Every structure is written in structure tokens, then in C-alpha cells.
Amino acid sequence: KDKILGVAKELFIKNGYNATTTGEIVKLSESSKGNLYYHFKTKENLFLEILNIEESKWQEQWKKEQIKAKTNREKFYLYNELSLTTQYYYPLQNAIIEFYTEYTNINEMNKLENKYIDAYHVIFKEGNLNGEWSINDVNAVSKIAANAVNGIVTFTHEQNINERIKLMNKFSQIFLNGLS
Template sequence: MKETILASARELFIKKGYTATSMGDIVKAANTSKGNLYYHFTNKEHLFLDILEKEEDRWASLWTKYEKECSTAYDKFIRLAEFSGSTQAQYPMQMALAEFYAKEHDSDLIKEKIEELEQRFVHYYHKILEEGVLNKEWTIEEIDEKSEMASAAFTGLDICFYLRDEKERIKLFKDFAQVFLKGMMK
């Protein structure tokens, strides 16, 4: 039943957004009871974060397959940009996620979980940038900061170009990745 709740809630968040989706909507869509819903999830925030974690696991699994096709850090960075712009990687919950992040969260646990999810993406950029330095493909100082900048920039691109067609998104992401790398290299 937990998976049914997650699937139903995911569809509602995609369709209606985070704020407009109520626990009552989720109960109805999942054809379950409030008691069953609250047995699995203490509140809407925890349910949403559980869905996000599963979405990011799916994204990571797909990216790992693409990453293996690349032989250099430069290729990986560009390929990550193309992958991020592709429909396959497109995050259908992007708008609900942006709405969720903009909301004030009182719980330290929620704030920690959001930070943990954000750091997963920062890690991908850090790993590639560090590999490029180690392989002498480029010289980049302050890799931690540059990794956070890359993650934030690509998240922004994803939000801004969400409705563009796939071919255009991929080109925009790839072009930005090339500009970003060129601007960082010494």
C-alpha cells in the first residue's frame, strides 16, 4: 500500500503542485484511509521527500549508465549537461520541487533532508571537476564552491527551460556547460 500511496501522491504533485495537493487528495487518489496514509507518512513534507529520494535514485541510476560512456572529465561534464537536458532525465516534479524548496520549513529534519538531496547533485559535479584536475584536463581552484555553483546553475536552467522541447533543452544545457567550464579554467 505504501507504494500505491507514493505513486498516487507523485502524480498529484506533478499535476497540482505541492501546495495545492492535500493529504485528503492523496487518500482519495490512493483509495486508502487517512489512518493508513499516516501510518506510512507523518505528514505531507515527509511523503514528498520520500518521493524526491526515489526520483533522485532513478536519476542517479540512469546517469551512471551514461557516465560509463565517457573517457574524460570534460566529456563527462558535457554529457551530464546533455543528460540533464534530456527528456529521459527531465524531472517531472521540478515545479512542485521548486515550490517545496521556496516554502518555509520549520522542521530541522526537513531542512537536513533537503540539504542532503541538494548535495547529491553537487557531488556529481564535484566528482567530475576533481577528476579533471587529477587528470590535468584543467586547473580549477575551490572545487567545492564551483561544484555548488554548477549544481545551482543547472537547477536554474532546468526550471527556466522546463517547457522547451528536448532538442533545444539539450543544446542550451550543453552550450552552458561549455561556457561554464571555459569560465572556470585557469
């Protein structure tokens, strides 16, 4: 089970959903095509299970890291820097978008997105309560921030990590200064 999950995740990250075949998982995970079945049934269910684990791991990791930022302003900076460095969830976004632009309401996938946006919602709601900013539509600002940061993460993979952190911090500064 655990060899199929690890190799699957890696191939999905490296090649996306379509280019990863159950045969290719079978060959590199030392297990039968019927071994993948029963444990996972289908390629889709294996991927969705990988996403469940990834988003739980990401959410665990953020629970621990957010104590390090005292203000919600600092938490926005921190969360966005961590999205670039984390091994969890963010590395799969290209596989996730592809899977999303193919699959049949499994879409009920939207509770995976709402979780990923909810970190910003807490940040922005709590910042509202602690007088750090005034935001009337937190739901909208949360979605905008999350998807914007996701674009900065996902579309700058080619680059040096220090420069990516520098671009991201400038984004965070512009964005927060724009809530003024």
C-alpha cells in the same frame, strides 16, 4: 503504499507541494486518509520519502550513464543533457523549492542537496587530476554549475526537447571554456 507514492509524485510534479492535498492523494490512489497515515504519517514525510527515492534513482541512473563519457569534460556535457531528459529528481525541483521555502531543522534536505552537487564535485575533482582543467575552489564551481544547470532545466520546461538540449550544450561549452 506504492499507489500513494506514484500518484503523490505525479501530483507534486504537476501542481507542486501546496496544491497537492492528502484528500486528493486519497481520492486518486484508492486508499483511506488513515491508510496514508501509518504508512507515511504525514504529507511532509511522504514527500521527503519521495525525494529520497528520486535522488537514489537519479544517482543509480548517473552511475550507469557516466561510463559512456570517457573524459570529465564529456561527463559534464552528458550529465547536463541527462538532467533535461531524466524522469528522476529534476521534475520535482519546483515542489522541492517550495517545500524548502516553508520547512524546522527535516532540514538536516541539505544532505539531499549535497548529494546532487556531489556529481559535479567528482567531475571537477577528477578533471583536476586528469589535467583537463585547473580549479582551485571545486566546492564553489560545483555549486555554481549544479544550480545554473538546474535553472536551465527548470525554467525552460515549455520548450521543445531538442532546442533545450541545444541551449544546455552551449551553456556547458561556455561554462567549461570559462574555466580556462
